[PDB]
Design a protein around this ligand. Sequence first.
Ligand SMILES: Nc1nc2c(ncn2[C@@H]2O[C@H](COP(=O)(O)OP(=O)(O)OP(=O)(O)O)[C@@H](O)[C@H]2O)c(=O)[nH]1
Length: 171
Amino acid sequence: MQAIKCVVVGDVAVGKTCLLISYTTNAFPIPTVFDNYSANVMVPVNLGLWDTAGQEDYDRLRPLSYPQTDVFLICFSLVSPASYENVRAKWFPEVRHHCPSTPIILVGTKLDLRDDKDTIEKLKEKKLAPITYPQGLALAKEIDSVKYLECSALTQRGLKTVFDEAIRAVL
Ligand SMILES: Nc1nc2c(ncn2[C@@H]2O[C@H](COP(=O)(O)OP(=O)(O)OP(=O)(O)O)[C@@H](O)[C@H]2O)c(=O)[nH]1
């Protein structure tokens, strides 16, 4: 019955499309066309999932999707400190400029990779380490997110929670 709009933003390759597709179809992919999806879920809610292009080239046009958004998911890769930094450097500021009062959920992605051997190896070779939970929770508090939630589109762990809370942030 109730219609809720949800826009997903964040650095390219943090897993925004896989996130939305894995949730809407319960399967893990990748479509190149930036699209919007939908889902009927009980929290009666018709959730509209709007994907975005995080590249800089679309900095000016991206925000055209923002108007009338009910809730935002600002995502960052749990195995990418760079995407973590850009949350406060770019995404939180951008969302707030266009939509000052709209609720925000901070989403950590690729949780399945935080414990991955070869992955930790890679980050280590660059003097970097995966974003621990406390760290993610800290950032959420900084930007005053309604909630901080970690998920994995590959295993779908915590996935259902992310969108349930994104909905409860509206109802
Ligand atoms: N291991 C693992 N890899 C993931 C997961 N989610 C996404 N990926 C990988 O991350 C890469 C980024 O995929 P996208 O979903 O397109 O990320 P995105 O750039 O933020 O979203 P779009 O630009 O809209 O496509 C893909 O090659 C996936 O294989 C995950 O949960 N676990």
